[PDB]
Amino acid sequence: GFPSSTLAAVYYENFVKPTCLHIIQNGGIQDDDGTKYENSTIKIIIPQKLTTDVNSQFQTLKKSFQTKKLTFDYLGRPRNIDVETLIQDGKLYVIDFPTVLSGINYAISNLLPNDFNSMSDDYELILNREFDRFIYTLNKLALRDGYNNLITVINEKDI
Amino acid sequence: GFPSSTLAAVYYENFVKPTCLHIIQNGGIQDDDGTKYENSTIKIIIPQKLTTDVNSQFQTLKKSFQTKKLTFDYLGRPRNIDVETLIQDGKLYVIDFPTVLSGINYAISNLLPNDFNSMSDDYELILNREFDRFIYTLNKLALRDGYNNLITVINEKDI
Numbered sequence: 001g002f003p004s005s006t007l008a009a010v011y012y013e014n015f016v017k018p019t020c021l022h023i024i025q026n027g028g029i030q031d032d033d034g035t036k037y038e039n040s041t042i043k044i045i046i047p048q049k050l051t052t053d054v055n056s057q058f059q060t061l062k063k064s065f066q067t068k069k070l071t072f073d074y075l076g077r078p079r080n081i082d083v084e085t086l087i088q089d090g091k092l093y094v095i096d097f098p099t100v101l102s103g104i105n106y107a108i109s110n111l112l113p114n115d116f117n118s119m120s121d122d123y124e125l126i127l128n129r130e131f132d133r134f135i136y137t138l139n140k141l142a143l144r145d146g147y148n149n150l151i152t153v154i155n156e157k158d159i
Numbered sequence: 160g161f162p163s164s165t166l167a168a169v170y171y172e173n174f175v176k177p178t179c180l181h182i183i184q185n186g187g188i189q190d191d192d193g194t195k196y197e198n199s200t201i202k203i204i205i206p207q208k209l210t211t212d213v214n215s216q217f218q219t220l221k222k223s224f225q226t227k228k229l230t231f232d233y234l235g236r237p238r239n240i241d242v243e244t245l246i247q248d249g250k251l252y253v254i255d256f257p258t259v260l261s262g263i264n265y266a267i268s269n270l271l272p273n274d275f276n277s278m279s280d281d282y283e284l285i286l287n288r289e290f291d292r293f294i295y296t297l298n299k300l301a302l303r304d305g306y307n308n309l310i311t312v313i314n315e316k317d318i
């Protein structure tokens with residue numbers, strides 16, 4: 001249907017779902033010191049602006065949240081899973097800025113005059129519609145699988 | 160625009176492009192024994208059928224091509240890059256079955272009667288249209304950046 005929905009579907013199937021299954025099946029995510037955090041949950045961060053350099057955007061968010069990388073395998077997966085994590089008060093949070101959101105910039109290209117400015121109300125509307133579709137798809141798939149209470153999706157503007 | 164185009168754009172920006180830049184900037188990909196292969200190129204494999212278990216599909220293709228995993232960092236990237244590789248006659252091939260293609264199944268859901276069979280001519284047409292858009296987008300972006308000669312995109316049916 002909409003590109004933003006399909007990007008949420010691959011992000012869910014190939015990242016969020018196996019992360020949730022690891023949390024459930026492993027009894028949590030393990031830190032460097034060997035502590036396993038049964039109470040592991042996921043915060044998915046939607047940025048206020050979407051840049052054409054999501055790698056630098058990721059780095060700036062990692063610095064701001066003071067996260068560190070942990071890694072785990074999910075059986076059958078082609079590659080390991082890497083997560084940015086914060087540990088507070090006996091709880092672990094995966095804090096993910098999805099690199100898949102770069103696809104939204106590709107989509108929107110055709111929807112704007114190509115003299116467009118990123119700060120305009122028109123542009124804020126079109127981007128927010130794509131984010132709304134992405135968020136709904138992510139939540140729909142998580143709810144269907146029973147992982148609603150493991151995942152929250154937060155817009156940067158609302159922090 | 161089309162979901163399949165947007166999936167190609169994220170696959171290109173967040174995987175194919177940094178792989179190409181590593182090959183160019185590093186003077187190739189390095190094997191376990193320390194041999195660096197200046198002649199490193201990418202074969203992107205489009206499957207004949209798209210399953211709802213791309214992880215098992217990836218494993219079956221890895222077994223058939225007899226590839227092994229190599230890993231490298233690309234400066235600024237949130238995570239390392241993992242590639243399946245084959246080495247033959249002084250040349251290295253990245254052989255990638257893109258897990259992003261799972262998104263095409265999500266897209267197509269609405270386009271078929273939901274009593275549909277995967278083997279029908281109708282279904283072969285709709286899937287092939289999505290693959291055609293994915294391939295064109297990948298090639299367009301690679302050509303724009305100058306990486307056309309590093310990448311070939313092969314349909315499994317044509318091997």
Ligand SMILES: Nc1nc2c(ncn2[C@@H]2O[C@@H]3COP(=O)(O)O[C@H]4[C@@H](O)[C@H](n5cnc6c(=O)[nH]c(N)nc65)O[C@@H]4COP(=O)(O)O[C@H]3[C@H]2O)c(=O)[nH]1
Binds near residue numbers: 096239
């Ligand atoms: N934090 C975290 N997020 C993850 C991880 N794996 C997947 N994701 C997230 O899930 C999205 C979809 O991944 P995909 O469908 O496998 O689709 C992927 C996959 O086909 C390919 N790709 C990305 N990284 C690699 C890699 O290291 N090796 C290979 N062979 N392909 C990769 O590029 C596509 C697009 O990737 P993105 O735009 O980055 O979009 C990714 C990213 O936002 C992970 O280990 N950690």
Ligand SMILES: [Ca+2]
Binds near residue numbers: 147148149150152153
């Ligand atoms: Ca939730």
Ligand SMILES: [Ca+2]
Binds near residue numbers: 307308309310311
């Ligand atoms: Ca080519």
